[PDB]
Structure formats: C-alpha cells, structure tokens
Design a protein around this ligand. Structure first.
Ligand SMILES: CCCCCCCC/C=C\CCCCCCCC(=O)OC[C@H](COP(=O)(O)OCCN)OC(=O)CCCCCCC/C=C\CCCCCCCC
Ligand SMILES: CCCCCCCC/C=C\CCCCCCCC(=O)OC[C@H](COP(=O)(O)OCCN)OC(=O)CCCCCCC/C=C\CCCCCCCC
Ligand code: HEC
Ligand code: HEM
Ligand code: HEM
Ligand code: HEM
Ligand SMILES: CSC1=N[C@@](C)(c2ccccc2)C(=O)N1Nc1ccccc1
Ligand SMILES: CCCCCCCCO[C@@H]1O[C@H](CO)[C@@H](O)[C@H](O)[C@H]1O
Ligand SMILES: CCCCCCCCO[C@@H]1O[C@H](CO)[C@@H](O)[C@H](O)[C@H]1O
Lengths: 49, 380, 241, 81, 101, 61, 49, 55, 54
C-alpha cells in the first residue's frame, strides 16, 4: 500500500545547507537561489558583451 | 480555443511543437548536438556570406582584388572573411560527426530523414565548391578545372555538358559569375531542405544511444536540450574562434594567395581537407571514367546503408564486433584523407587503392555479414 | 629530383599567439623594400596611408608619397599627365606589365610581394632562408646562365641575384645594416604587408579566449544545474500484491 | 508536433526528484564522476585505439618509405669512373 | 563439445546489455513483427519489460551502469518475447505465402 | 549575506534581473576592455606604434 | 614546339601503333620539326610541364 | 551608412545587388506565412456571408 | 550580370546583345515586375472592397 512508500535518501546530492532534516530549508533558500541566479546573470552579461 | 497562446497561435504553435514542448529522449548524448550545430553553421554562413557578398565583385579581373579590398579596407572585413572561410570547415567537421553518429546508432533506419540528409551533404558540397572558386586564386581555378572536367568522363554527353556548364571552352568569367549566383542560392536550398529533414524526423522523434524505445522516458526539449545545445555550441565555438583568430590559414593552401594563372598549373594540386578522402578514391582507379564512378559511389553508397542493416538491434552499442568494424572504417577514412594529400607515387598509390577497396568492402560486405553473424551469437 | 630543403623555424618576435609585430622592425623593413626590392617588386595592395599610425606619422607618409610621380588624367584635352603622389596612392609598380618585367629580368617574373609570405610554404621562415641562403652549387650540378644557386628555392636555380648584402643601405634609425639584420626586417615588413590586421586579430583572440573560458564555465554550471533534476532522479517498480 | 500524453502505456513506476536548488550541480566528482570516466575510458580503449594505432603505423611507414626512395643508392655509382 | 555455448556466453558478456539490467529481448529493434509480439505479452511481462527499459534509459542518461551484482547472468536471461515473435513471423509468412495465389 | 541581498534586490523580480544584466554588461565592458587592452600592451612593451610614436611625433628638422 | 633530331627519329621508332590512341608521330604533323598542340591534359584538364 | 560612403556609388551598387538577390526569397518565405494565416479561416467570398454550406 | 559601377551598364548590354535569348529574359524580368505590381494592386483592391482585411 502507499503507506509503505518513502522518499529515498538524497544526501549524496543535497546542497550542504539543506543536508540536516531538522533545520528549516527556508533560511538558506535565498542564498541557494541567489547563487544559481548569480551564475545565470553573469552568463547573460558575458553573452551581452 | 486554447488557454495559452504558445499552443493556439498558428506560428507559436509551430515553435512550441518543435522547440519547446517537443518530446525528446532523456538519454541522448553529445552526438545528438551536431544537428543544432549544423543549423547554426548554416545561419552563420549565410549571415557572413551576405556581408561578404556586399563587397564582392564577380568578374575575373576584379574577384581576387575585391576580396583583398574586403580584407584590407572594409571594417572588420578580414574578420568576416575568416569566419566565413573557417565556418565552412566547422560545417564539414559537424556534418561528418553527424553522419558518423547516424551510422553508429542506426539513425539511418529513419529512411526519409536519412535520405534527405544525404541530399543535404551533396548540396553543402556543391555550395562549398562554387564558393571556393570566387576568390579566384590558383587553387580556385585549377581545382575548378579538375572538378568540372570530371563530368567530361560521362560518355557521349560529357564534353557537351562541360562546355555548357562553363559557358565557354574552359573555366572563365562566365563560369565565375554563374558560380557566384549558384553559391548565393544553394545555401537557401540547404535551409529549405533542412526543414524537410526536420519534418520527416518529427514523425518519429529522435533515436537514442540504446536503440530501444524512449516513450517511457521523454522530456521537453526546453530547457533540457536548449541548454545542452547552447553549451555544445560554446564548446565547439572555442576551437573555431581559436583557429580563426590564432591560425587563420592553418587549413588553407598558400597557392590560393596567387591570382589564377591559366598558363601555369601548381606543382601540387590538392583539395580542401574535407574533400581529400573522396579525391583519394577518385585517383585509386587510374581509369578516367572508372575513377568518376568510384567517386560517385563513394557518396551515393550512403543511400544504400539502410538496406544493409542485418542486426536485430538498432545501434552498435551492444555489438562489439560491429564497433571494431566501425572504427576501422573511421580509420580507413583517416588514411584516405592522408593519401589524398600526397602525390601519386609509390607507396601512396598502393596504400590508396587498399583503403579505397576496404572502404567499399566494409560497408558493402563486412557490416551486413558481421550483423548476421552477431544475430546468431545471440541465438536469433 | 624530388629533393628539397625546408627552412628552419626562426623565433620571430611576432610568432607567439599574443605577440604583436615589432613596429620598429616593420618600419626598417619598409625602408628595405622602398630602397631595394621595389626596383623589381610591386606591392599592389599597400598604399602610403596604410603606413600612418603603424610605422610612420601622417607627415612622414605624405612625404613618402610625394617622392613618387603618378599618372593621372585625362585632363581638359583628354591627355594623361603626371603628378606628385598622395597618401591614397598605392605603391608604384616597377613595370607596366609582366611582359616588361620579364623583359628586364632575363624572362623571369618578380612576383608582387603583397601576399608573398602567405603564398609560400614557410612564410617569413622561407623568405628569410632564401634571402640569406645563396651559395655555390654542389658537385654535379650546373646552374644555367642567368640563374643563381639557392638550395632553398625549388629546383635550386632562382632567377633573382642576391638582393641584399652588408651595408647595402643605411637605416636612418642607426641599426647596424647587416645582411641578416636586413632580411629579418624586410621579412617582418612582409608579414605586415600580407596581414595588416595581424595585431588587432591577436588582441581579439585574447578577449575571445577570456570571454570563452568564463562563458563556457557559466553555461556548464547552468546545464548541470537544470539537469541535476534528472541526474539524481530515483525510481522503483512497485507492482501490486 | 503534439506528443506528450499519448506516448506509452506505463504502470506501477514511482520516481523521485529534487529541485535543482536543493542539490549540487556537480556532486561527488572524486567518489563517482572520475571513477566512472575511467570505467568508460577503459571499456572502449581496446575497441577504438587499435585501428587508429594501425593507421598511425601505416602512416609512419609510408611516409618514411616515400622519403627513403628519394635518397641516393650508392650502388648506382660504384663503378662510374 | 561446448564451443558454440562458449562463444555465445562470451558474446553475451561482450555485448554488455546485461550491465543495464536488460534482457536480450529488451534490446530488440521494434520493427513490425516485434511491435505485434509486444502487444501479445501478458500484462506483468509487459510492465516488467517497461521498467527495465525505463531504468536503462535512466542509467544511460546518468552515464552509469548497474553494480556488478545486478548484471543479468547469461543463464538467467529470460527469452520472454522470442516465443511470441516466432508465432508472429510464422503467421505473417503464412499470409504472405497464401496471398501469392 | 551578499547572495541573499543580491537575490532579493536584483534576482527576484524579472524586471530588476534585466536592469542588473544591462548595468552589469556596461560595467563589465569598460573593465574588461581596459584590462584586456592592458594585458596585451604589456605583453608587447616597446613594439606598438603607441610605444615608438614619440620618436617621430614631431622630433626632427 | 620546334623539334630537333632526337624528337623526330626517337618518335617514329617506338611502336607505330601501341598507345591509348594509336597514331604515328608523322600523323599529326605538316613538318617533322614543328609540333603544335593544345597543352591541356586529356584527363582532367591540367597542363603538362 | 546605407550608401557605404558619401553618395550613391559602387559600394551602394554591390550591396543593392545582394539585397535584390535576397529579398525575393524573404517574399517567398513570408508568402507561406500569408497563406498559413489564411487557411485558418479559408477564403472570403463576394457575398460576405458564410460559405460553409457550399464549399 | 556584374555589380560594379564600371561594368553594370555594359554587362546588361552584354546580356541583351550576346547571351542567347538574353534580351528575351531581360524583357520578361523587367516587365514581369510591372505585371507583379498590376496584380498586387488589384489583389489589394479586392481585399478592401470585399472586406478581406477582416
Ligand atoms: C568523411 C571524412 C573523414 C575525415 C576525418 C574524420 C575525423 C576523425 C576524428 C575522430 C573523431 C573523434 C571520435 C572519438 C570518440 C571516441 C569514443 O567515445 O568512442 C566510444 C563511443 C562509445 O559509445 P557507446 O557504444 O554508445 O557506449 C556508451 C556507454 N554504453 O562511441 C561513440 O561515441 C559513437 C560513435 C560516434 C562517432 C562518429 C565520428 C566519426 C567521424 C567520421 C566520419 C565517419 C563516417 C562516414 C561513413 C561513410
Ligand atoms: C555594454 C553592453 C550592452 C548590452 C545590451 C544588451 C542588453 C540585453 C539584456 C536583455 C535582458 C536579459 C534578461 C533575461 C531575463 C529572462 C530570464 O529568465 O533569464 C534568462 C534565462 C535563464 O532562466 P532562469 O535561470 O530560470 O532565470 C530566472 C530568474 N528569475 O535563459 C537563459 O539561460 C539565457 C541566457 C544564456 C545565453 C545563451 C547564449 C550563449 C551563446 C554564445 C554565443 C555568443 C554570442 C554571439 C551572438 C551573435 C549574434 C549575431
Ligand atoms: C633586380 C630585381 C630584384 C630585386 C632588387 C629583388 N628581387 Fe626578388 N625576385 C626577383 C626576380 C626576377 C624573381 C624571380 C625568381 C624566379 O622565379 O626565378 C624574384 C623572386 C623573389 C621571391 C620568391 C620567388 C619564389 O618563387 O619563391 C621573393 C620572396 C623575393 N624575390 C623577395 C625579394 C625581396 C624581399 C627583395 C629585397 C630585399 C628582393 N626580392 C629584391 C628580382 C629581384
Ligand atoms: C545541413 C545538414 C544538416 C542539418 C542542418 C541537419 C540537422 C539535423 C537536426 C537539427 C537533427 C536533430 C538533432 C540531432 O539528432 O542531431 C538531425 C537529425 C538527423 N539527421 Fe541531420 N542534418 C544535416 C545533415 C544530415 C546528414 C548528412 C545525414 C545523414 C546522411 C543526417 C541524418 C540525420 C538523421 C538520420 C537524424 C536522426 C538522429 C537520431 O538518431 O535521432 N543529417 N539532423
Ligand atoms: C552553406 C553555406 C556556405 C558555405 C558552405 C560557404 C562556403 C564558402 C567557401 C568555401 C568560400 C571560400 C572562402 C575563401 O575565400 O577561402 C566562400 C566564399 C564566399 N561565400 Fe560562401 N558559403 C556559404 C554561404 C554563402 C552565402 C549565403 C553567401 C552570400 C549570400 C556567400 C557568399 C560568399 C562570398 C561573397 C564569398 C567570396 C568571398 C571570399 O572568398 O571570402 N556564401 N563561401
Ligand atoms: C507577394 C504578395 C502576395 C502574394 C503572393 C499573395 C498571395 C495570396 C494568395 C495565394 C491568396 C489566396 C487567393 C486569393 O484570394 O487571391 C491571398 C489571399 C489574400 N491576400 Fe494576399 N498575397 C500577396 C499580397 C497581399 C497584399 C498586399 C495584401 C493586402 C495588403 C494581401 C491580402 C490578402 C488577403 C486579405 C487575402 C484574403 C482573400 C479573401 O478575401 O479570401 N495579399 N494572397
Ligand atoms: C573550386 S576548387 C575546390 N572546391 C572545393 C572546396 C570542393 C571540391 C569538391 C567538392 C566540394 C568542395 C575544393 O576542395 N576545391 N579544390 C580542389 C583542388 C584540387 C582538385 C579538386 C578540388
Ligand atoms: C524553428 C525551425 C524549426 C524547425 C522546423 C520544423 C518544422 C517541421 O515540423 C513539423 O511541422 C512537425
Ligand atoms: C598590424 C599593425 C597594427 C597597427 C595598429 C596597432 C593597433 C592595434 O590595436 C587595435 O587596432 C584596431 C584597428 O587599428 C582597433 O579597432 C582596436 O580597437 C585596437 O585594439
């Protein structure tokens, strides 16, 4: 039955700040996104150049 | 009718069904990148080509110098000329790898896509040929002489067709102006036929490296392959630009920096690298007409590939014997390329005939034979 | 019969991928051309204006051009006349047509030098080796009258007598005018004549490389970022009872 | 043109994925990536390399042989006078 | 002796489709005959085939293979489709033969 | 908290993300050109007309 | 071309008819010393040194 | 800019030739778009009333 | 044709005087352009009259 289903463990892939299950992931969200979006914005700059 | 324009609009609908919501196999590798690179070369060649065409003059007394005027006086004229000249090479590197991928992974089983693909190769080749004549250097002239004279081998109508093509009794001004027109036109026939290519392709969608159905695991082209393709673009753009900006003439004959002289033939007439292997094959048969046929077949053989598939499996991924056979073929093409750049003299002549012979042997006999042999080892 | 000597590779100061041309050497080279080679060699594609901001000042360039008489016209009577040169004029041809040229060189035709380093395998390496490589033929070889022995020229019998020797001219910049020094300079000048965009081309290559490194990395990350979803994806087959 | 929704008949398969922002873009480079690059390389070198090695040799030979035939054969002038 | 058997077992391992967990039959090119045979497979055999394939495509995109302990063994490869496929081809040839007057 | 501040102020709204890319390109261009042009000229000290110029730039007669 | 003595006898000497296109050296001539040709190789149109 | 100089001259001529060679094809391309939009509704008719009852 | 201010005019003359049916091809092209405009103006008129612009 579906009750017997659980999401596997993604520790081998999680970013450092969301590794701990007992910590809100929202506190590192703006950093995690800011970083990724920083890379993108930079690529746009280089590209525009 | 539809809640979102991307799907209802008659034009966007099209961009959406071929570049946004298009279902693609989740596992296609970097060998699936060359299609879009080819499309980008095409658009790139066209753009730089028009820019060059706007300063070019098709007359045997002004061709060579108008190109020099372009490279010496036109703002960034030299840059645009390098990008166009070298872009032609990036185009052939990409088309060869595209074909290779196809052969290895049995993409040819998509017959209409494959056949239009062969037409595209032939058209790209004609384009490069008529394009290469324009600067009108020694190599332009003599190569155009060697090639156009090949057609005179055709019995009965030969001499007649040649003089017709030339517009006179030899490669001259009327040959140049008509070649310019052709060179200007063909790239667009290439663009049009590309649409047909992609149209047949979408009837089935892409093949994938495992040769097994991917309906159970497809993904939207965007953003998976749009991103993957842009990456592939910049990876192949570095060598292109490095070559273009740091070694502009690495791949060209110095003989083409000398105005065409109808009375002096260069000591060593050799073709551009992407036509070398075919040249090697042309020379293997010392007989004029026999060499032409050999050359013809060297490319038309591609139309036969779909009928020589004996494997019960589509790709060569799980076929170790065919894989060896595949790399032999690739290496065989390497040898032909090399042989095509040497003079007709021992040991080259024999090495050349061997390679030519094994080229046709691998494709016409070994591949289907081994394919059958492999089915039996699987107990099929 | 098929034997040929190939020139060695000299360390030109403009050989590196980011190495510009030594403009002092190019300016000197121009002098060698103007005072020695231009007597038999044309340079159809270079104009005096091209010198400005490269090897000479606009004033110097104007002077250089005025030293030459150029044909112009027709005038009011439909007559052709002479006039002093203009920076917009191209370097003067030593002969009206190749026929005249050969006629003045034992039937040999001195090629235009505008693209000579690109029209010869070896480029400046070959031109340098040729200029500084004349010598007596080896035993068993006889050069026909009018030709000279040069192991670097194909066939080894060239129709050009050695063009340069020590102090055949004086560099107004004081550099010791030795044959090899001269060859070196004119060859540098020839490289310039053939590809005036040489330097700018390389400055662009520099930026191309940097932008490329940067951009390739940024896009590599973005591709990996988006694909992470699939790359780490897990699945299972849970068939019923 | 439109295909998602009518592709295949699939049953009983569960998949799990994480947002790109919750994970590393290029994770386990040394514990996973490289070890696999080696695996892949290894498993193909003796399929690919061989024929290219063969071509390389043939090249070397034919090139050397060509130049060798340009050299003088001392035995053509031993009794020349 | 066991020559043919030796060879077949070598090829099987050399082919390597077993490193993805695929059965020989999972790798067949879906031409007309194969497509028809697939339609005759029993629900479970069909769903199992599907999972194995979806899973292999996942491995393919990840550029990984299964841990050596999960590789299918030459003697445990189940020829689940061959029986059906043979009937299909047998039927087709019958029609073909019969339609030739 | 640069990543955090950067995200909220520049990368959150698609509009601000665009302005950031424009000013970014502007500042990048100015700095990149000057820097690259320096690296080039430095690797070629004494060879450019820039370097030689003074000698003939109105010095004789 | 203006032929000498070794350009006329050396010719009529090598097999009368034993070539691609069988002809006698005195066939295409109005004078033994004068041989006028179209210096174009009957292969792919190149020029013979 | 359009002229490539200070008046209609040779650079104007060569670029006009290129343009003249190219545009006809843009016309052909756009014609396809023209007809593509048209088929969304089919032709209009002299009476301006629906012809679905008589096609 | 030759796109150079010193050869344009004469290459067109060369076309009409030396090229087989050159003069014919040139007439057809030159007048074809007029035929093209005649047809486009009527096409447009039709459109305006019958409200095809809707
Ligand atoms: C034609 C004119 C010829 C001109 C010269 C040709 C250029 C030669 C340069 C070599 C090109 C580099 C190729 C090296 C790639 C090495 C490599 O990765 O090979 C192994 C790898 C293993 O793949 P899988 O079996 O799917 O396994 C994955 C995990 N299960 O094989 C592949 O990448 C697939 C092969 C595609 C490459 C084809 C490129 C060959 C190009 C030349 C033209 C040949 C075709 C013409 C036929 C007529
Ligand atoms: C001084 C220079 C002045 C520059 C003037 C040009 C100004 C152009 C500014 C346009 C505004 C750009 C902003 C785009 C906003 C859309 C967007 O979502 O970002 C792009 C979006 C990213 O998605 P997310 O990561 O999910 O972002 C969500 C954030 N909320 O898509 C992209 O990845 C596109 C950016 C990558 C560019 C790809 C180009 C790489 C190719 C290289 C070849 C080189 C160029 C040569 C061009 C030749 C043309 C003839
Ligand atoms: C007196 C006339 C004369 C002078 C002065 C002269 N040349 Fe030449 N040059 C020739 C002639 C004649 C040829 C033809 C050689 C041949 O083809 O046999 C030639 C050929 C050459 C070639 C190469 C030809 C080939 O096929 O490789 C170059 C390069 C060249 N000269 C460079 C120079 C340079 C640079 C100088 C000045 C430093 C110079 N020449 C001065 C007469 C001259
Ligand atoms: C101007 C030339 C060409 C262009 C622009 C072009 C473009 C494309 C594009 C965009 C794709 C899809 C992406 C990909 O799989 O790479 C594709 C696929 C394909 N093309 Fe081409 N192609 C060209 C030439 C050829 C040639 C020469 C052949 C074969 C002789 C060929 C055979 C195919 C086939 C069979 C596919 C199927 C790929 C698969 O296995 O899924 N193409 N091509
Ligand atoms: C499939 C696309 C194309 C290919 C493969 C291609 C290839 C070539 C080649 C091989 C050259 C010779 C380069 C050299 O000088 O060494 C050339 C020259 C030229 N091409 Fe293209 N070309 C393409 C499209 C175009 C287009 C669309 C135009 C113009 C509308 C064009 C205009 C020119 C011009 C004017 C030249 C002569 C000037 C020069 O040689 O630099 N080309 N092209
Ligand atoms: C190279 C130019 C053009 C071509 C080849 C072209 C072609 C066509 C074709 C094939 C049709 C369908 C048959 C017909 O109704 O005549 C059509 C319809 C139409 N075209 Fe064009 N057209 C062109 C220019 C224009 C222009 C200039 C306008 C308006 C400013 C226009 C407006 C329309 C419209 C509104 C229709 C709808 C006809 C109806 O009422 O059913 N076309 N055109
Ligand atoms: C106009 S001469 C020419 N066109 C090229 C670009 C070409 C030929 C055939 C097919 C595509 C492209 C080429 O390599 N040559 N050169 C050349 C030199 C010697 C013998 C044959 C050709
Ligand atoms: C933007 C160019 C996309 C390639 C054209 C594919 C059109 C054929 O696509 C078909 O309609 C489906
Ligand atoms: C090879 C002789 C080069 C002489 C010029 C030295 C300046 C090289 O530098 C470059 O020159 C280009 C055109 O002059 C400019 O457009 C570039 O911005 C500049 O960086």
């Amino acid at each position: 039955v579906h009750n017997d289903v659980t999401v596997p463990d993604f520790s081998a892939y999680r970013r450092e700040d969301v590794m701990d299950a007992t910590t809100s992931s929202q506190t590192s969200s703006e950093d995690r996104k800011g970083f990724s979006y920083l890379v993108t914005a930079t690529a746009c700059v280089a590209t525009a150049y | 009718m539809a809640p979102n324009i991307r799907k209802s609009h008659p034009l966007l609908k099209m961009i959406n069904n071929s570049l946004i919501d298009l279902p693609a196999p989740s596992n296609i590798s970097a060998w699936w990148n060359f299609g879009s690179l080819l499309a980008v070369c095409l658009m790139t060649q066209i753009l730089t080509g028009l820019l060059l065409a706007m300063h070019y003059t098709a007359d045997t007394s002004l061709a060579f110098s108008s190109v020099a005027h372009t490279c010496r006086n036109v703002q960034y004229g030299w840059l645009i000329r390098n990008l166009h000249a070298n872009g032609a090479s990036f185009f052939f590197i990409c088309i060869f790898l595209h074909i290779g991928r196809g052969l290895y992974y049995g993409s040819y089983l998509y017959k209409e896509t494959w056949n239009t693909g062969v037409i595209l190769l032939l058209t790209l080749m004609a384009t490069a040929f008529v394009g290469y004549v324009l600067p009108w250097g020694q190599m332009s002239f003599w190569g155009a002489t060697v090639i156009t004279n090949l057609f005179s081998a055709i019995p009965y109508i030969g001499h007649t067709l040649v003089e017709w093509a030339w517009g006179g009794f030899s490669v001259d001004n009327p040959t140049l102006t008509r070649f310019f027109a052709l060179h200007f036109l063909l790239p667009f026939a290439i663009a049009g036929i590309t649409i047909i290519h992609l149209t047949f392709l979408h009837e089935s969608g892409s093949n994938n490296p495992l040769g097994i159905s991917s309906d159970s695991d497809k993904i939207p082209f965007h953003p998976y392959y749009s991103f993957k393709d842009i990456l592939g673009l910049t990876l192949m753009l570095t060598p292109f630009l490095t070559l273009a900006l740091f070694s502009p003439n690495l791949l060209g004959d110095p003989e083409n920096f000398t105005p065409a002289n109808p009375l002096v033939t260069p000591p060593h007439i050799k073709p551009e690298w992407y036509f070398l292997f075919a040249y090697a094959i042309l020379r293997s048969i010392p007989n004029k007409l026999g060499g032409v046929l050999a050359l013809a077949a060297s490319v038309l053989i591609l139309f036969l590939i779909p009928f020589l598939h004996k494997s019960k499996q589509r790709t060569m991924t799980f076929r170790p014997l065919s894989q060896t056979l595949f790399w032999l073929l690739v290496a065989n093409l390497l040898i032909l390329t090399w042989i095509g750049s040497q003079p007709v003299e021992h040991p080259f002549i024999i090495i050349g005939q061997m390679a030519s012979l094994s080229y046709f042997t691998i494709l016409l006999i070994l591949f289907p034979t081994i394919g059958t042999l492999e089915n039996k080892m699987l107990n099929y | 019969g098929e034997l040929e000597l190939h020139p060695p590779a000299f360390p030109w100061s403009h050989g590196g991928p980011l190495s510009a041309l030594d403009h002092s050497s190019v300016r000197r080279g121009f002098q060698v051309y103007k005072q020695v080679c231009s007597a038999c060699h044309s340079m159809d594609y270079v104009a005096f204006r091209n010198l400005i901001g490269v090897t000479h000042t606009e004033a110097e360039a104007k002077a250089l051009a005025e030293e030459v008489e150029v044909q112009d016209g027709p005038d009011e009577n439909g007559e052709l006349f002479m006039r002093p040169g203009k920076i917009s004029d191209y370097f003067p041809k030593p002969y009206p047509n190749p026929e005249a040229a050969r006629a003045a060189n034992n039937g040999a035709l001195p090629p235009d030098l505008s693209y000579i380093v690109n029209a010869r395998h070896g480029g400046e390496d070959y031109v340098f080796s040729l200029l500084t490589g004349y010598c007596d033929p080896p035993a068993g070889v006889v050069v026909r009258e009018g030709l000279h022995y040069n192991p670097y020229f194909p066939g080894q019998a060239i129709g050009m007598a050695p063009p340069i020797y020590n102090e055949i001219l004086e560099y107004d910049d004081g550099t010791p005018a030795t044959m090899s020094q001269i060859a070196k300079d004119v060859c540098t000048f020839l490289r310039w004549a053939a590809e005036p965009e040489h330097d700018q081309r390389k400055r662009m290559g520099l930026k191309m490389l940097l932008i490329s490194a940067l951009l390739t990395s940024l896009l590599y990350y973005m591709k990996r970022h988006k694909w992470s979803v699939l790359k780490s994806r897990k699945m299972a087959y849970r068939p019923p009872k | 043109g439109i295909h998602f929704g009518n592709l295949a008949r699939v049953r009983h398969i569960i998949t799990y994925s994480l947002s790109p922002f919750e994970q590393r873009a290029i994770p386990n480079i040394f514990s996973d990536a490289l070890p696999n690059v080696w695996r892949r390389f290894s498993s193909q070198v003796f399929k690919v390399a061989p024929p290219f090695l063969g071509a390389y040799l043939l090249y070397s030979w034919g090139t050397q042989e060509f130049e060798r035939l340009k050299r003088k054969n001392p035995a053509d002038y031993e009794n020349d006078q | 002796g066991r020559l043919m058997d030796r060879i077949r077992k070598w090829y099987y391992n050399a082919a390597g489709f077993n490193k993805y967990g695929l059965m020989r039959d999972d790798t067949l090119y879906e031409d007309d005959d194969v497509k028809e045979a697939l339609k005759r497979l029993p629900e479970d055999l069909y769903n199992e085939r599907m999972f194995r394939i979806k899973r292999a495509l996942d491995l393919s995109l990840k550029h990984r293979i299964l841990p050596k302990e999960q590789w299918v063994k030459y003697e445990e490869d189940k020829p689940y489709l061959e029986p059906y496929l043979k009937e299909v081809i047998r039927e087709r040839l019958e029609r073909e033969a019969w339609n030739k007057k | 908290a640069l990543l955090r501040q950067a995200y909220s102020a520049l990368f959150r709204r698609t509009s601000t993300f665009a302005l950031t890319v424009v000013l970014g390109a502007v500042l990048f261009e100015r700095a990149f050109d000057q820097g690259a042009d320096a690296i080039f000229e430095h690797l070629n000290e004494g060879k450019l007309w820039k370097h030689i110029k003074h000698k003939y730039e109105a010095s004789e007669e | 071309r203006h032929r000498t003595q070794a350009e006329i006898n050396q010719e009529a000497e090598v097999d009368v008819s034993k070539l691609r296109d069988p002809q006698h050296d005195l066939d295409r001539v109005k004078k033994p010393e004068w041989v006028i040709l179209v210096g174009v190789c009957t292969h792919l149109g190149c020029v013979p040194i």
